[PDB]
Design a protein around this ligand. Sequence first.
Ligand SMILES: Nc1ncnc2c1ncn2[C@@H]1O[C@H](COP(=O)(O)OP(=O)(O)O)[C@@H](O)[C@H]1O
Ligand SMILES: Nc1ncnc2c1ncn2[C@@H]1O[C@H](COP(=O)(O)OP(=O)(O)O)[C@@H](O)[C@H]1O
Ligand SMILES: Nc1ncnc2c1ncn2[C@@H]1O[C@H](COP(=O)(O)OP(=O)(O)O)[C@@H](O)[C@H]1O
Ligand SMILES: [Mg+2]
Lengths: 537, 526, 527
Amino acid sequence: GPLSVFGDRSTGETIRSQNVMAAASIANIVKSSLGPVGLDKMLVDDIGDVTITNDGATILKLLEVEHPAAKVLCELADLQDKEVGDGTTSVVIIAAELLKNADELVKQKIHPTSVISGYRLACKEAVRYINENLIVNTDELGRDCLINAAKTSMSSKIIGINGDFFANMVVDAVLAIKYTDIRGQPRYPVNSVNILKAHGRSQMESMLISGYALNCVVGSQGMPKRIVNAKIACLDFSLQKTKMKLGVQVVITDPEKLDQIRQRESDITKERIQKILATGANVILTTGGIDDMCLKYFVEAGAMAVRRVLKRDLKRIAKASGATILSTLANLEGEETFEAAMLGQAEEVVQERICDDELILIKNTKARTSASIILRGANDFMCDEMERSLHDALCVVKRVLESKSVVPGGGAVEAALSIYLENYATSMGSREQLAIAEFARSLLVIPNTLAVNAAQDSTDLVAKLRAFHNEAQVNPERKNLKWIGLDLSNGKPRDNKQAGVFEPTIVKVKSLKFATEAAITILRIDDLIKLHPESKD
Amino acid sequence: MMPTPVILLKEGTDSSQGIPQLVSNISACQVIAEAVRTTLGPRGMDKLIVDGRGKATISNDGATILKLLDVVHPAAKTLVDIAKSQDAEVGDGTTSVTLLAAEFLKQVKPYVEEGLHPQIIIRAFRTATQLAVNKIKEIAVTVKKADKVEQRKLLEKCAMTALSSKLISQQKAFFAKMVVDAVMMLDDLLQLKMIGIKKVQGGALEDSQLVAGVAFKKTFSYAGFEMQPKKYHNPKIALLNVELELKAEKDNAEIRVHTVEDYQAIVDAEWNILYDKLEKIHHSGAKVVSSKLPIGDVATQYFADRDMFCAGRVPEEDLKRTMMACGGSIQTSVNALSADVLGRCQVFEETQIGGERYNFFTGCPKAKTCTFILRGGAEQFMEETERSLHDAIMIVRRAIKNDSVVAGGGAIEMELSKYLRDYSRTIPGKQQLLIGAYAKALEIIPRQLCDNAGFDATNILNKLRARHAQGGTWYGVDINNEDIADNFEAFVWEPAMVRINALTAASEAACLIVSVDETIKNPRST
Amino acid sequence: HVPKAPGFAQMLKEGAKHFSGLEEAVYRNIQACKELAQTTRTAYGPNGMNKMVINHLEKLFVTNDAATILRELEVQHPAAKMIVMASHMQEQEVGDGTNFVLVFAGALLELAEELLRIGLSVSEVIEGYEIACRKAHEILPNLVCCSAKNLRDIDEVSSLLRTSIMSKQYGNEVFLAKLIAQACVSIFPDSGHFNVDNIRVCKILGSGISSSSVLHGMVFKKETEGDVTSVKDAKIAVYSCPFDGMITETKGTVLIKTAEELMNFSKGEENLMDAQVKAIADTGANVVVTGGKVADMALHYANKYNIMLVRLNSKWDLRRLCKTVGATALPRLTPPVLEEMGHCDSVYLSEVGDTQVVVFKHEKEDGAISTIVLRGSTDNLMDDIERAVDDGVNTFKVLTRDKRLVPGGGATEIELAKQITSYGETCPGLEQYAIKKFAEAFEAIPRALAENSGVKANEVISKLYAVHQEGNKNVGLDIEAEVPAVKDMLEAGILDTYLGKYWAIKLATNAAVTVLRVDQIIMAKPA
Ligand SMILES: Nc1ncnc2c1ncn2[C@@H]1O[C@H](COP(=O)(O)OP(=O)(O)O)[C@@H](O)[C@H]1O
Ligand SMILES: Nc1ncnc2c1ncn2[C@@H]1O[C@H](COP(=O)(O)OP(=O)(O)O)[C@@H](O)[C@H]1O
Ligand SMILES: Nc1ncnc2c1ncn2[C@@H]1O[C@H](COP(=O)(O)OP(=O)(O)O)[C@@H](O)[C@H]1O
Ligand SMILES: [Mg+2]
């Protein structure tokens, strides 16, 4: 008679109501961590680890989910870090409210393919309207655009101070790693900034190290820990005793030739260490291993040798100091040449005190003048929060300098799109106009969440918010009310042009493209079959 | 991990707080509204609920379905009590009260998640309800030519729509004619105990009938009932409350005798006590005897020899209907029997309807009661037919004392959305998002008339909002044709107090769900 | 390996715990009573929220009154029971202000924790609270501005009863004020004792609150067992014996010795019952109400002589019927009633809300007793209006005992916060800190009124002290809309229970003092 599957089958409006409650179970979590009045959470594990964070990606990655519609919204937050980097609480609330308003349409016996086709006409029109209603590029504002866009990202986190201490350190970090490319591409690789953590003084003592901050120790306590006018030798091979390979064995037939082979394992080893040290090299960085026999040659000659450094840290030092990453001997059948003209340069390599640990600093690197940020917090829970908040702040200034276009934040984009799409649904709307009209109400949840978390008036402040944006579209008298946002500290609509509340363009363009595409896949689960777990057979 | 005291809070109780509590109450009312959602409209199906004992009850009434779900949710019990009060006040407002009260919470469900302290929602719900129950009274039509054939036609149209959405398809013209004729035979009290609805298994719905008199089920008799033939052209009924047995003992009598000459005189006196009571029933014309107390083998054979009929162990609910049918009086003592206490009928026979025997009375013109015998093919089929009969009786019971009727279907629920949206555009403040949300919540009654049979319900609401804003105010949803139609001209009528008590009970239930902010449950459940 | 700490001096219990000191006993009693103050803080005021409380009997109670919530919550903390029994004494004394006790004594213990952790011990916070409590009873007669004396009729008490109604029924403040005005004034004893037990509530399930009314009489929920339901003369003979005859007491045994005594016993018993029913029919009686059962022979002659029978199974409802129609329950069998007959106007039956009721409706002589017939959509709604009805009857008994009133709505607690602070600054001692903390407990009572209205309590409490500059003494809170700009309470008419404010301050002070006296707690094993 029925289906003889050994799992479970649920059809109809059961799964159509379960996917909305699965998406609302995720959105109601992250609704309390949006905007400058948002608050952080606690993520306690079974082993006892506590993670205090408010970013939309760190919470949903550590949180376990079971529903298939819940894994779509959790993987939607992971894509926002790679594509944009701060846009990762706002996408989850929009994509869940896109399913909440579309559930009210399919309960009115409206076909979901008209809602899918109605959402594509509203998503492509939202990108078209936001690209024709921008204020200015990065020429008029200058450095004031980079600082004000950085403070908007920090307002939802622990580094949202009233001053410009953390804002100036981010702009000075991205501007110091300007790496040009072919065909006129000024790239800004923000992954080259080594963000370090140390439980020390307050947040106002966060050092901006112009150069690189290596997270390693010297090793042997007989080397000079401060070298002025240093020459960095970046190399990746273990400075240990000469061990033969698997194909080579030592089969001796004469007992007199025994001790000459035993001394040869250290003579070939020390032959490399004397030709890399006679060329003026004082700092040697190694990703392999330097044993206790080879540490004597640096104490005797007065050189610094750092062992077991990361491979991702050696590439950031050799590119910034002009050093060449050498793995072995080379240069056309040469015995030991080392190409001594390709040594790195540094002004000062100094191991400072980082509150009961050792940290090596390189000052200005003499070639590229890179930057590294050492964070200072109260405990380890604040340092993990300060690292995530700084990494999201580095991604904001990266997209502004690459794509010179900013949009007003604080719900100013979602207020203008809530009224333009209602007029867009009336012109060319015959049967898909109800999906475009619900696309505007789903976008209004971003200024609605700012009024809930601020404990302000909800149905009056957003009603006063769209009152200025309606007069900016139907009354062409140059009212300039396209930048009207929210003042959550006062509870009144303010102008985000003069207040300095700036967000990048692709933090909302890619947010509206990812949330609309995720809402289509969850809208097509009218039939769902769940099989039994095959564990013990 | 937070609460770890030495002395706990109360015992172990959990309590939600704030905005997650209120959405938990609104979404709970949406689940219990699905059990009355598919039972609306003439194209609405019924539901079958089986309990733990295995008893099946198939019905579509809101007062029958919601009482068998065994709902233990605190907020969802509010929608069950308004379905019970609608059956107690009106009788046919049941599925519409539960579903409309759930829409009052779902239309404010995006509003309660974003601010909007609920004292503004309670004030807006009470304001829109008082304007809704006043526009019904100002538009409900009435007549000034009653006590004629036109008033009986008004009672028949309200009973056909009350018999709609039931298990009756083509028997609307047959059953609803009997419902109007049932309440017109009653007195000026309209008591529901003055009409017997008895279910006889076997026969179609066309085999049912409305007896002008009464009829009982012919309960357990004794030897002598195959005699006493059932042909009476003008009998008299003796309603009694006495025992006609030889063993009538007062349970405290000790008859101490001394000799054998007086011992036989006691046994002869015990037969003379019973035979003197039978001589009082005799010599008075009372050929039919009815008593709620049992009759032994002695008085059964005495009436068979004197060509008299009797019936013992009659239920007390049937003797009260028998007293108002024949116009007599129940006499406990047989010494005061006369012509003023006996009944009078014309046709009294014992038929064989459905296999079981039934002693029916007919022919009495001064009949203040009636009996509607139901014939069906199943026990659950006749229980639904009895439940559908009570909804048509309680509609026509209230229609006599208040003949103000309105249009059926979604005609009133759509035009109340017109008068409330026009009122919401004339007041400032936050009430434009609440009075207008109250008007959009009333549009689900024409939605469930269409969603149960397709009908393209999105396009049919654009025709309803355009017709009510242009011309008449009684345009609703046609069931046979997939179009809008004037329900007042199509004789789809319902009394005005059906929708007045529906809007009043749904608003007071919706104001109670939004007013509770904490729910504390004690774990002691024994 | 790992050692452990054993018992030291008096560990002799078999599973019981022990508390001693300030941190283990005194500070934990404060934090337990603070959780009850924060629980009922949301349900306090006219904008309070209801609470669906389920007891151990698995039934639902939804209300906003703090007295009926604590009766269903199974509280197990011992110091938390002291603030519950103090609120239960407010219901027994005046019947209103039970929640005022949880806010004031919850703030008295909370501010006492700030004094024990900064300063003086319990020997001076208790003595400091008692000085400010005696001074608080000297300002309350000075804050009386109006009185319930002139025109004691249904017009003046319709406005003086709105404050007790709007605190629990905000939208129905106009309908319930008129229903409590036509019931409490109609049972006036002509300058005597006002009994609150003479007002009953008949819950009839049906339509909404607009169809509720007050009937001058009593409404029961039983049947007739007869056909004489239309009674217009209404001469009621009330009996307490079972209306089935006169039986003996010890054993009871019919002794038959001949055939004549057996045949005449059944006919002689019917003639004996016939003479007793016709003895009350010749006296003009129409309604015969009994307490016990009624035999079939009594029902035979009740319908013959055309008299109505009423069955009352409850013995307490029979005594209320004697005060309704003015009769006397006779313990013996039916006599010729000389002067203890009842006299009503119309006794009939009607099925209202699918419930056949018996109504003893008085038409001309209206004032003997009153019964408010409440209508509701749910049974849970009618229990909440009944609590609001009983708060209106209990407020009418307060105005009988003392006709003085004080302006509520936050106006009284600010003036009590200003005068106690004036006494605290003029006290040259170390106990002046507890006097200043006693006035701040009155400051938190209009704070709960503003937090329940969605208004910021910092700007609300700042405007109250700014307009109380030594001569106003009447401005309270305007909770009708946001951005309040608060108005006068005498112009709005928000003033209630001066005697309620006199007892709620005294009970909450003695409750908070009794908690601070507890220094050592010895509990037993719960079983
Ligand atoms: N000063 C401000 N005024 C108003 N709104 C602000 C201000 N600063 C930040 N916001 C709002 O707070 C929101 C924070 O979003 P966020 O959680 O950072 O997104 P994501 O999770 O993608 O990084 C932004 O959408 C922005 O509109
Ligand atoms: N002939 C008809 N045409 C259109 N609609 C009808 C017709 N007959 C009944 N209806 C609709 O069916 C619905 C039945 O409601 P019902 O379930 O009886 O309410 P309740 O449960 O309160 O008795 C009514 O609201 C009415 O509008
Ligand atoms: N119209 C009004 N305006 C302002 N405040 C009011 C109004 N009506 C009542 N209140 C306030 O609501 C509170 C209700 O207190 P209540 O809970 O009745 O105390 P209790 O529990 O002792 O009866 C009162 O203290 C009063 O100040
Ligand atoms: Mg009160």
